[PDB]
Curated annotation (Swiss-Prot), chain A:
Changing residue 119 to A: Does not affect association with TRCF, but weakens interaction with CarD. It comes from Mycobacterium tuberculosis (strain ATCC 25618 / H37Rv). PANTHER family: DNA-DIRECTED RNA POLYMERASE I SUBUNIT 2. This is DNA-directed RNA polymerase subunit beta. Changing residue 427 to L: In strain: vr11 and RJ37; rifampicin-resistant. DNA-dependent RNA polymerase catalyzes the transcription of DNA into RNA using the four ribonucleoside triphosphates as substrates. NCBIfam families: PRK00405.1 (NF001616), rpoB (TIGR02013). InterPro entries: DNA-dir_RNA_pol_bsu_ext_1_sf, DNA-dir_RNA_pol_bsu_external_1, DNA-dir_RNA_pol_su2, DNA-dir_RNAP_su2_dom, DNA-dir_RNAP_su2_hyb_sf, RNA_pol_bsu_bac, RNA_pol_bsu_CS, RNA_pol_bsu_protrusion. Changing residue 409 to L: In strain: vr4; rifampicin-resistant. The gene is rpoB. GO terms for cellular component: cytosol; DNA-directed RNA polymerase complex; peptidoglycan-based cell wall; plasma membrane. Changing residue 422 to Q: In strain: vr1; rifampicin-resistant. It catalyses: RNA(n) + a ribonucleoside 5'-triphosphate = RNA(n+1) + diphosphate. Pfam families: RNA_pol_Rpb2_1, RNA_pol_Rpb2_2, RNA_pol_Rpb2_3, RNA_pol_Rpb2_45, RNA_pol_Rpb2_6, RNA_pol_Rpb2_7. One of its GO terms (molecular function) is ribonucleoside binding.
Curated annotation (Swiss-Prot), chain B:
Induction: 6-fold repressed by starvation. This is DNA-directed RNA polymerase subunit beta'. The RNAP catalytic core consists of 2 alpha, 1 beta, 1 beta' and 1 omega subunit. When a sigma factor is associated with the core the holoenzyme is formed, which can initiate transcription. DNA-dependent RNA polymerase catalyzes the transcription of DNA into RNA using the four ribonucleoside triphosphates as substrates. Belongs to the RNA polymerase beta' chain family. It comes from Mycobacterium tuberculosis (strain ATCC 25618 / H37Rv).
């Protein structure tokens, strides 16, 4: 419910849930709004921390201003960031290739100190890119999304190691800041606590304390129990604060003549002045929590401090001593224990707001540097802030972050699910994050702190396994960047309805219950012993009195894409991973009917994906058509919504938007008003419902091969629309100017039939591989011709035709109609790149059918290519003559541990046929816990089994028992769930029953037409003379080292010589072999490879005399 | 890399035939040496 | 302290260093001679003028 136009999808959920699914795009929207300073974020923060609501831009300007000279006789300040209206709408930007942006305005104030003068000016910072209603950015027309990054929060981190030789514990600590230097206080094999600073290991803690100013008496007083530190004091062999500072300087600063005043300020600059050592607000908060300095002080003064350093040293020494709790003098007591990097109490989430804020800061640093540089050179009293400020570094930093940065990813859109799951994506790799080569196996693990904060299932299965994750459905992001998780607090065994958000630290501190705990429908637990997660991730049985927290609802630990998988709890983990990752590659079909059996996370996922038009204000439908909807609001005003008819997605898929309301209907604000690419009646639909058999059929469905009925081809059950675009620019040249015209040199009038008068093809004119799309000619220049060419030209009377033909030809292996032509020009004043006079885009769309080799997959990761499409007649059919549509293999089910597909098949058959529980004498025992309005269902009714609380196996058996007949008196499916199929090829019935049902399968984006490739002779590389690679160019297959090894091991020589010499590199050999093949002569002997010649030249260029000798 | 080698060699020649102090001449010679080292193997010694 | 050869020994040890950074080595190289004053510049310029007159009269 809670959606006005929600289709009635009956649910199998046993227990109610108190908390609804939050806004799935909050992680992006709230972050960017906090960056901006929007009133929505401002009032939210006022509700939750009104102490200091500061936006990202405000924080940057406040920490920058004021800017002083060395003399400090004059200053400049920034204040009051304020945005302007967007320069162009979203659709116009996407069409004309602009960037969705808005101007930035600030109030710069220039202040003189000696004389006294204020200069307030309105300064235009730059065109700030903006985030749309769907949480995505538009850069140069295309849509981009910046993924949140998982980085370890700065602070203190203690660990212990074993030396494995003397077998004694060696503790350590890393005070890792942001924008600063490192420093570690380890414990050695001996008892000399080292103070390695900036990777310079020497100089025990006594010298550091003396440099800070601590005398030996103070050191002993503060650390009396420390036998290790008293020993270091005894063997300090260095006395005197100035002597310690001298040692500090000679150690950390080799090659510089030390002085008694440079050393006195070097430590302060390195660790106490915020200019060069500024651990962020998160770092300060983490340090304060770890040591317990200030419990109520508002956070500020982000630089380190001597009390923090001495607290860290004392923490290290007490941890080595083996204490359990610590009390800093003047601070609360805090437990002492090692810290884990993989714990989500330390891995903060740097979202889009913080990423863009960091780029803004690094740009404004350059701007302030330029301001300071020009601020002294230019004469005083003659400058204004407009002359002072340079905004080019800031805008350049923004642009160079948005483009060419692997955290600003090309927003893949194969379906609304793909878009939604590309948002809410947590990537651990990126600038400032760990790379794949340095990514050890330790980080690619599901730490027990991930429960409810990151999906343990959904993650890429390739080389990026474990480095990329997605947020959970109920997860929320802390302002610092930690990931919160809602919980219902239970008090003295009374499960309350108050929801409290906890992070990893709080969850570890407290004791959490289980989501499916058997409550007594009153607040109490029926059984005192309940399942519990402990601090270390331990799972135990605990009396109900000690439990103080409980999960909001089941399926909280799982992400959206994985929550869309029915019967998940019966699947394995690897196959659930595959299904979750392969649910996001489904292509949009032309009908997109809703799935029969699914979960409750389809309607919410579809309407929160932003690819479905939804009425913002209630009213009555006035006018409805295939292009627009006019909703007549309750009060006078009207509003028109423009559908997107056949718009090209970023990955070449259809993006149709069909209305689902009539001319007299009334719609309430929030109702789905128009379908999307992969939607049906508002909810989600990634595929179709197909009749399913589990028998192995004549070896065509062998080893994950799939057989399809021809009915899918005939009725276009699985038929996708793909739109490809072609771009050709008629640009200026040195020898003249290229023009787009019909007159193409050395061409016939046959290929020009489809071309209009201005050169481009007609709209709706079909095209074939090798046709002409745009006729462009380039000035060829003056070139000498062969005498045979001269003789032919003289014979035929044809002229020189001094321009060259370079026309936009549709590449190899494409067909389909032409939808629309968008042509730009310089004469009509369009924003074109310099040097380009004419640009034209041609959109070609094809209606690809289903065919052998295409990849099909269910929702449980049972993938497989289409082996053979049989005709309708020769497919197994039930007793009533209905033929099955798909034929899986039985051998692939058990060894992959994914009987979730079998359960889904059974439930789908039950839903399609319709059932009726016969409660003539009481409700049957198996259906005792079944909810109401589920004992009987109409044929082709939809059901909804949630993720971890769904239909039970006993309930499935009971439903299969009552399977009311189709049209006559006939129950085609027995109690076991099988059926009597007849062989449509031979005729005799199959000797044993075979499972049948309605599984939900999807057409993946791995089509054959995008994969098939061939090459005989194409373009060649530049430095080496080997052929190119990839389907984009012509390219040839790579004959790798392993293939060479196999070729050698086969006892084979001549094939290897052929593939390595006269097929790849022999420049004077390829032409000879082609000529010999054409003329029918023997293949000539090969020559030495041009690659080997290049290697010889390189060796000679490396001052290595290499000479090849005959004898 | 070849441009840097050629530029530093030419500048060393100009300094030598003009007549320059030993500090500048040695600095330019070290410049040429480091440039040749970078050309032959970048990042082998020092910052790449 | 400022005496007892400790500071002097540290200074000479730090001066007899590697400084593999070429730029830093050049900076430490230039940071040897002290700065001058206008009278010293005038005297030096007079010396160069005398030297050039001397060599041209040799020629």
């Amino acid at each position: 419910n809670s959606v006005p136009g929600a289709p009635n999808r009956v649910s199998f959920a046993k227990l109610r849930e108190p908390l609804e699914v939050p806004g799935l795009l909050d992680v992006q929207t709230d972050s960017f709004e906090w960056l901006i300073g929007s009133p929505r974020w401002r009032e939210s923060a006022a509700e939750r921390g009104d102490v200091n609501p500061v936006g990202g831009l405000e924080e940057v300007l406040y920490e920058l201003s004021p800017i002083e000279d060395f003399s400090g006789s004059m200053s400049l300040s920034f204040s009051d960031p304020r945005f302007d209206d967007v320069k162009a709408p979203v659709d116009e930007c996407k069409d004309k290739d602009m960037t969705y942006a808005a101007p930035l305005f600030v109030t710069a104030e220039f202040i003189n100190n000696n004389t006294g003068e204020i200069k307030s000016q309105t300064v235009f910072m730059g065109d700030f890119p903006m985030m749309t209603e769907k949480g995505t950015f538009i850069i140069n027309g295309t849509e981009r999304v910046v993924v949140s990054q998982l980085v370890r929060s700065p602070g203190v981190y203690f660990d212990e190691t074993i030396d494995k030789s003397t077998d004694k514990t060696l503790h350590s600590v890393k005070v890792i800041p942001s924008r600063g230097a490192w420093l570690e206080f380890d414990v050695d094999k001996r008892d000399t606590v080292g103070v390695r600073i900036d990777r310079k290991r020497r100089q025990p803690v006594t010298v550091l304390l003396k440099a800070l100013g601590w005398t030996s008496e103070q050191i002993v007083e503060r650390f009396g129990f420390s036998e290790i530190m008293r020993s270091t004091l005894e063997k300090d062999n260095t006395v005197g604060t100035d002597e310690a500072l001298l040692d500090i300087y000679r150690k950390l600063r080799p090659g510089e003549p030390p002085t008694k005043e440079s050393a006195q300020t070097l430590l302060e600059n390195l660790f106490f002045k915020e200019k060069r050592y500024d651990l962020a607000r998160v770092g300060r908060y983490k340090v304060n929590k770890k040591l317990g300095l200030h419990v109520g002080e508002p956070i500020t003064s982000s630089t380190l401090t001597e009390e923090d350093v001495v607290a860290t040293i004392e923490y290290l020494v007490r941890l080595h001593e083996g204490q359990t709790t610590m009390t800093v003098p003047g601070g609360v007591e805090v437990p002492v224990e090692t810290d884990d990097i993989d714990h989500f109490g330390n891995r903060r989430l740097r979202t889009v707001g913080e990423l863009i804020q960091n780029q803004i800061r690094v740009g404004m640093s350059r701007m302030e540097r330029v301001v300071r540089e020009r601020m002294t050179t230019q004469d005083v009293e003659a400058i204004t802030p407009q002359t002072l400020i340079n905004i080019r570094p800031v805008v350049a930093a923004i642009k160079e972050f948005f483009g060419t940065s692997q955290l600003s990813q090309f927003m893949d859109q194969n379906n609304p699910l793909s878009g939604l799951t590309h948002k809410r994506r947590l990537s651990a790799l990126g600038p400032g994050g760990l790379s794949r080569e340095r990514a050890g196996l330790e980080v690619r693990d599901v730490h027990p702190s991930h429960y409810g904060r990151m999906c343990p299932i959904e993650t890429p299965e390739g080389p990026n396994i474990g480095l990329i994750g997605s947020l959970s459905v109920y997860a929320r992001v802390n302002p610092f960047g930690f990931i919160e998780t809602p919980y219902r607090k239970v008090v003295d065994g009374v499960v309350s309805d108050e929801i409290v958000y906890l992070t990893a630290d709080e969850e570890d501190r407290h004791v959490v219950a289980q989501a499916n705990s058997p409550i007594d429908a009153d607040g109490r637990f029926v059984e005192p012993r309940v399942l519990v997660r402990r601090k270390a991730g331990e799972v135990e049985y605990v009396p109900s009195s000690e439990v103080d927290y409980m999960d909001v609802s089941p399926r909280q630990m799982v992400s959206v894409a994985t929550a869309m998988i029915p019967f998940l709890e019966h699947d394995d983990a690897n196959r659930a991973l595959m299904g979750a990752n392969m649910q996001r590659q489904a292509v949009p079909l032309v009908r997109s009917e809703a799935p029969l059996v699914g979960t409750g996370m389809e309607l919410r996922a579809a309407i929160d994906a932003g690819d479905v038009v939804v009425a913002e204000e209630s009213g009555v439908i006035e006018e409805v058509s295939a292009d627009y909807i006019t909703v007549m609001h309750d009060n006078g005003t009207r509003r028109t919504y423009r559908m997107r008819k056949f718009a090209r997605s970023n990955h070449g898929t259809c993006a149709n938007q069909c209305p689902i309301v009539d001319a007299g209907d009334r719609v309430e604000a929030g109702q789905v008003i128009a379908d999307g690419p992969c939607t049906d009646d508002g909810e989600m639909a990634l595929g179709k419902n197909l009749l399913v058999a589990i028998m192995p059929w004549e070896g065509h469905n062998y080893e994950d091969a799939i057989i399809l009925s021809n009915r899918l081809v005939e009725e276009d059950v699985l038929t996708s629309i793909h739109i490809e675009e072609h771009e050709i620019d008629a640009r200026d040249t040195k020898l003249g100017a290229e023009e787009i015209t019909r007159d193409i040199p050395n061409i016939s009038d046959e290929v020009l039939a489809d071309l209009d008068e201005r050169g481009i093809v007609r709209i709706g004119a079909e095209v074939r591989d090798g046709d002409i799309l745009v006729g462009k000619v380039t000035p060829k220049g003056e070139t000498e011709l062969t005498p045979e060419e001269r003789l032919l030209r003289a014979i035929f009377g044809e002229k020189a035709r001094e321009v060259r033909d370079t026309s936009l030809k549709v590449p190899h292996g494409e067909s389909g109609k032409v939808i629309g032509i968008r042509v730009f020009s310089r004469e009509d004043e369009d924003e074109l790149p310099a040097g380009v006079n004419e640009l034209v885009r041609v959109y070609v769309a094809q209606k690809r059918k289903i065919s052998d080799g295409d990849k099909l997959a269910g929702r449980h990761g049972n993938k497989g290519v289409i082996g053979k499409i049989l005709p309708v007649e020769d497919m197994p059919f039930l007793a009533d003559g209905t033929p099955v549509d798909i034929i899986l293999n039985t051998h692939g089910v058990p060894r992959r541990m994914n009987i979730g597909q079998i359960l889904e098949t059974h439930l789908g058959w039950c839903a399609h046929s319709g059932w009726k529980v016969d409660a003539a004498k009481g409700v049957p025992d198996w259906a005792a816990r079944l909810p109401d309005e589920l004992l009987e269902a109409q044929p082709n009714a939809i059901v909804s089994t949630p993720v971890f609380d769904g239909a039970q196996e006993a309930e499935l058996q009971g439903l299969l028992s009552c399977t009311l007949p189709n049209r006559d008196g006939d129950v085609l499916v027995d109690a076991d769930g099988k059926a009597m199929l007849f062989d449509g090829r031979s005729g005799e019935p199959f000797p044993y029953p075979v499972t049948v049902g309605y599984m939900y399968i999807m057409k993946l984006h791995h089509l054959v037409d995008d994969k098939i490739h061939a090459r005989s002779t194409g373009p060649y590389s530049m430095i080496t003379q080997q052929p190119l690679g990839g389907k984009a160019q012509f390219g040839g297959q790579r004959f790798g080292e392993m293939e060479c090894w196999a070729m050698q091991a086969y006892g084979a020589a001549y094939t290897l010589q052929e593939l390595l010499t006269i097929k790849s590199d022999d420049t004077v050999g390829r032409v000879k072999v082609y000529e010999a093949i054409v003329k029918g002569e023997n293949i000539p002997e090969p020559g030495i490879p041009e690659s080997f010649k290049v290697l010889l030249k390189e060796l000679q260029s490396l001052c290595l005399n290499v000479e090849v000798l005959s004898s | 890399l070849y441009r840097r080698v050629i530029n530093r060699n030419n500048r060393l020649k100009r300094l030598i035939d003009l007549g320059a102090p030993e500090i500048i001449v040695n600095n330019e010679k070290r410049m040429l040496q480091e440039s040749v080292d970078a050309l032959f193997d970048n990042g082998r010694r020092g910052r790449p | 302290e400022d005496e007892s050869e400790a500071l002097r020994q540290a200074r000479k040890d730090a001066e007899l260093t590697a400084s593999a950074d070429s730029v830093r080595a050049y900076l430490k190289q230039i940071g040897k001679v002290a700065l001058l004053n206008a009278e010293e510049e005038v005297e030096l310029a007079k010396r160069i003028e005398a030297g050039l007159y001397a060599t041209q009269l040799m020629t």
